[PDB]
Design a protein around this ligand. Structure first.
Ligand code: HEM
Length: 110
């Protein structure tokens, strides 16, 4: 099956490399990017992100709910447009399908 866990790991490497300040909103704030795989808070976030992707593909994802929760962290359209770019790169590096349509569904509520 598609290695979404590896995709998500690459996504966060791309995201925090381009926008390091985004990392400050997480429980792994301050942790070196190359060491995130060994951080408990990151493991949990990465897993939830993978789950969300599998939910989006499976048809159960609550994009409105995810959008609302991100707004509740002061994360909105600008951030998700930036994330769309990083996720496209991560997917391409794994021969995985692009997830732009999934991000667009979240953007439709932001
Ligand atoms: C591909 C785009 C993204 C996806 C699929 C995604 C997915 C998720 C998911 C599934 C959660 C957990 C929600 C829950 O527990 O109900 C979450 C939480 C969160 N996301 Fe995102 N996210 C994305 C982009 C971003 C970006 C760009 C930021 C920028 C700061 C961000 C910041 C956060 C924060 C701060 C949390 C809460 C972390 C915590 O509870 O400690 N997300 N995200």
């Amino acid at each position: 099956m598609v290695n979404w866990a590896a995709v998500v790991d690459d996504f966060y490497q791309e995201l925090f490399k381009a926008h390091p300040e985004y990392q400050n909103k997480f429980g792994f704030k301050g942790v070196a990017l190359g060491s995130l795989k060994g951080n408990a808070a990151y493991k949990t976030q990465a897993g939830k992100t993978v789950d969300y992707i599998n939910a989006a593909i499976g048809g159960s994802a609550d994009a409105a709910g995810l959008a609302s929760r991100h707004k509740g962290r002061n994360v909105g359209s600008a951030e998700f447009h930036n994330a769309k770019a990083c996720l496209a790169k991560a997917c391409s590096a794994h021969g995985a399908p692009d997830l732009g349509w999934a991000i667009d569904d979240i953007l439709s509520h932001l």
